[PDB]
Amino acid sequence: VVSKLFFSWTRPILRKGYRQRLELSDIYQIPSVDSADNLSEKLEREWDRELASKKNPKLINALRRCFFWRFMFYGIFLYLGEVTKAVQPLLLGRIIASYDPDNKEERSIAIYLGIGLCLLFIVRTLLLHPAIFGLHHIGMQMRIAMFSLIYKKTLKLSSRVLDKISIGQLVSLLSNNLNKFDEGLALAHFVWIAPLQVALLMGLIWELLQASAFCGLGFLIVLALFQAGLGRMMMKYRDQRAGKISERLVITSEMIENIQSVKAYCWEEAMEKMIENLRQTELKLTRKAAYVRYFNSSAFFFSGFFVVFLSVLPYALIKGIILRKIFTTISFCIVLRMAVTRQFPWAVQTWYDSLGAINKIQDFLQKQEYKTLTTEVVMENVTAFTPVLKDINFKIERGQLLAVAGSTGAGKTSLLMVIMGELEPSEGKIKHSGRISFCPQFPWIMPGTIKENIIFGVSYDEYRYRSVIKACQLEEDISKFPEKDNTVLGEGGITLSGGQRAKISLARAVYKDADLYLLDSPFGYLDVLTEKEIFESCVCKLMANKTRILVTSKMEHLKKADKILILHEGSSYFYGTFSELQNNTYLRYITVHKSLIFVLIWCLVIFLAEVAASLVVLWLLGTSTSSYYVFYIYVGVADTLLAMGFFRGLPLVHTLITVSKILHHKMLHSVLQAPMSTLNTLKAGGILNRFSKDIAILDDLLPLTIFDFIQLLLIVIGAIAVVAVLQPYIFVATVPVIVAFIMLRAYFLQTSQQLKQLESEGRSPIFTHLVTSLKGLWTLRAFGRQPYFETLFHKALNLHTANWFLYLSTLRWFQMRIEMIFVIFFIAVTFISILTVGIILTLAMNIMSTLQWAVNSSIDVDSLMRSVSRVFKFIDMPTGGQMTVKDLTAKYTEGGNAILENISFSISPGQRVGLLGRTGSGKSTLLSAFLRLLNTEGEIQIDGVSWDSITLQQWRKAFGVIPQKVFIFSGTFRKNLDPYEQWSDQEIWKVADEVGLRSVIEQFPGKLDFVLVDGGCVLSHGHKQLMCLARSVLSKAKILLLDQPSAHLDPVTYQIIRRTLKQAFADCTVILCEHRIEAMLECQQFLVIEENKVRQYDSIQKLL
Ligand SMILES: Nc1ncnc2c1ncn2[C@@H]1O[C@H](COP(=O)(O)OP(=O)(O)OP(=O)(O)O)[C@@H](O)[C@H]1O
Ligand SMILES: Nc1ncnc2c1ncn2[C@@H]1O[C@H](COP(=O)(O)OP(=O)(O)OP(=O)(O)O)[C@@H](O)[C@H]1O
Ligand SMILES: CC(C)CCC[C@@H](C)[C@H]1CC[C@H]2[C@@H]3CC=C4C[C@@H](O)CC[C@]4(C)[C@H]3CC[C@]12C
Ligand SMILES: [Mg+2]
Ligand SMILES: [Mg+2]
């Protein structure tokens, strides 16, 4: 009961982190009270009751019904601590008054008042920090519960709504409340405490001064109204900035998720300039908001002297004054100014932010839902949404395969979604058993082992798993990795090839036992032989007992299919059978800008001039009462004489934002120029979290926190120096305090930094799991694995929250053991109970009263400095047509498996050198090694210029790339086709022609103006391939490395690729990696990547 009160349970973790490293096991396990599952259960029950019983559902009521009693129980103790703070200066002024021979009504009562002031100090100690920690815990619990509720709603979110809300919206939504909602609950409870403290202090100052407390309160109220107006005007500057932040975040997320494609296209300058275009707009509002918040937070320091002036003039002008009763006024007014200028506007701002976040989150939870209501799949007169489908109708019995064929953009995938239940048929009905197994057209590989990616959250079945992995031809690929079957794949499956990803997705679809199977072209990225073997082993032999609908464009599959449905423009052209058809961090933060140092020098010079002026004025100015109170007045009013005005704080804020600008620009340039192996080393959710938080902190929190720390440090230094020049014993007495302060701060910093880094790197899993949940929500709701993904999210939330709560508990231990212990049990007990010299060491109390605040600001600065440390650690990253290659070894890592081992060949100019090889052989590896994206070796001399005779970008400029991973970023069709805008709309409309996008672009509301959100989800997969083809055509170059251009096209649309090959690339060399026999027939030279070694053939007949 006392261990929790004193937070002595953090002793073991602090002791371990003092001399060791907190890797994974010494982080304490989460308690059961704040477990994410339990918190989500309680909040979900309350929210469901609220929207079932009330008329206008409000999340604030649901949160109140479960947290209000604890909130108020901590708030009353917080108010008691504030009351002990506001009653302290009465005792202080009645104690330090007994320092002169004047013994008026004070005889032998200082010894009876010091022991009371000590008790008040210790009761403030025991009553403030536990309440603050309780409020922090309540905030963390509320954040956990709301995050889990949001994740459940996202799992249940409709498909139509997802067409507009993207990853950036969600990541910006959880970026703020993850580290502000918790810390605001210890500051939003001053809304009724600050008025009460103001009332109490007004009563006391009316007791002291007759009728000047109200006169001072008038100016204080005017300043508080101005502060509230500034806060309201500042909320607007963040509302208009959140959208820009989200857009930049999603743009850079798509950029880094396809950094291979960016490097292949040489889109480093283009995408850098694109991101800075949004960065400038965001930073304009960031700078405006930072100026406004500087003026809002500097109204405390530049108000003390004016408040004292206005509260003394109407009394001292007619009734006299003495230093005792002006110092009591100053002591009361310091607390009054803090309460009404630093505590009430802060509380109002925090309440506004919390209510806005709660309302936005409730709006998110109040979006459209996703409704679903012998497996004889019937479908009659179904129309989908111009209509994507039109009068599509079919009937399938149990154990009867049906094949859906048609042109690109016909609506085969759309029909599959209408079958599953995602798309809403405006007219018609769908009748089938609920169980559905889906193999998406673009395979989705979630982070985790291959076993997890295949089983997908069901009971492990040895025989079924072996049969699936043997039928899908995946055993050969599986028995090559260091882990035989349980090998961990990165997010998005970037370690595997396209064919391996397709095989894994098809295996996952097959493994699940469902009545209906929707194989959305599972043989798109697979070559002819593997596709044939999989079709007659995993679609016609294993699952030859249950109905399955698969999209195909091969006459063999159509002949096998018992029913054929051909779609053209969304209309069922034919529906029958085939037979029927046949008829250093600080040192580098400051020095990264050549103007931050100048601003700091200016501030230091002005501060020194102000200190000299104060010292000479005090020397000129300085009986018995006035012989020692003058320094007390100066050190109680120093917060105004040594405050930064608009001449030394506004430039500091501006430079501290420009530092964030240059840091982000350098970090983005380093990301673009980082080696591909190191980019593979990191993740994508981690990159998104870094660009979301470690730049937002630098933009908003860090400049203002550094301003506050410098303000407090300057005030402390000036108050020390001016008084110590006159009275050196002040600085003599302050040393034994500051040494312990610095000692404890250092003793806790080397563990707080580790905990902060652990929290920062434990934040990435939540974002990287939500990213995959949103990317594969389609298959998630097809498979019904929402409970499994909810359990995964809860595990990730617990993993992050245990670490974060441990860090906050350690920080609270430090901020208690310094503030309310290392002052209250040393200074306020041995500097007041020495009543014998009591003037030259009692002012140490008053100086330390703000030195502890300076130390708090410094420790907050160092806590925030971890973001800059991470940003800098990222910044430190390193950086005719003939071809002749020799001794080329393409390894993805220095110590991995050499994919190619001494491959050598020659390519004549104007020769289409097609490339063959089974899936997983290394064809894409060879194409990437041509651009030396990976490590690579040897020389790729082209007409004379070798690898080392030309810089990397100039080398890559002479290549045309069509990657298997189609890269489309957010932006218009014009931007997608040419970020550099080298060719105008007239010169790109022709490229849209002769490629098949004339009938596709014009369908959208804006011709070359539609914003392709969600990674080009609006287009189909064939249209994505055609867009990449058109982009390659626009990027007029030679020695094109075509990497499966017609990956999912059909022979009707493959003629587009064919005539583009024979027209646009009239005289050049093509290295096309197409798996289509029709496209391979026209090639003049062939390379077969077998046994990890290429060959040199000359004709198809010599090939076979
Ligand atoms: N980034 C990577 N890091 C490590 N290994 C990789 C990486 N990318 C691919 N591999 C592996 O190295 C080998 C090279 O395959 P590659 O990616 O070149 O595909 P591929 O044979 O061209 O594919 P397909 O014909 O199916 O399109 C494969 O075994 C693949 O799983
Ligand atoms: N999310 C979406 N919002 C609006 N229109 C969409 C969306 N997804 C697809 N479409 C459009 O619906 C039509 C049908 O596309 P669909 O993906 O069903 O084609 P498909 O037959 O699967 O094509 P492919 O041969 O490329 O696989 C196209 O005109 C496409 O642009
Ligand atoms: C926490 C707050 C709301 C409690 C109520 C306000 C208090 C602080 C105010 C209201 C009335 C005030 C009192 C009004 C009159 C007197 C008589 C005078 O000879 C001594 C001070 C004294 C006793 C004042 C002290 C402060 C006082 C008690
Ligand atoms: Mg499709
Ligand atoms: Mg490939």
Numbering used by the authors: 11 to 383, 389 to 400, 438 to 635, 847 to 885, 908 to 1121, 1129 to 1171, 1207 to 1431
Q: How does the study describe this entry?
A:
In the human body, the chloride channel Cystic Fibrosis Transmembrane conductance Regulator (CFTR) mediates chloride transport across the cell membrane in multiple epithelial-lining organs, including intestines, biliary ducts, pancreas ducts, respiratory airways, and sweat ducts.
The current study reported two cryo-EM structures of E1371Q-CFTR proteins produced by a lentiviral expression system. The E1371Q-CFTR proteins so produced show highly uniform conformations owing to the E-to-Q mutation abolishing ATP hydrolysis at CFTR’s site 222,68. The yield of the E1371Q-CFTR mutant is high, ensuring that the sample can be effectively concentrated for cryo-grids freezing and that abundant protein particles can be imaged for cryo-EM structure determination. The sharp and symmetric elution peak of E1371Q-CFTR proteins from size exclusion chromatography (SEC) indicates that the sample has high purity and homogeneity, both of which are characteristics ideal for cryo-EM studies. Upon deposition on cryo-grids, the mono-dispersity of E1371Q-CFTR protein particles is maintained, which facilitates later particle picking and processing. Our cryo-EM analysis of the E1371Q-CFTR mutant reached an overall resolution of 3.4 Å and revealed a conformation closely resembling the previous structure obtained using the BacMam system, affirming the compatibility of the lentiviral expression system with the BacMam system in producing high-quality CFTR proteins for cryo-EM studies. Thus, the mutations introduced to stabilize the CFTR protein do not disturb the overall structure of the E1371Q-CFTR protein. The fact that the phosphorylated, ATP-bound E1371Q-CFTR conformation is well conserved regardless of the presence of various CFTR potentiators and correctors suggests that this is a stable conformation representing an activated CFTR channel.
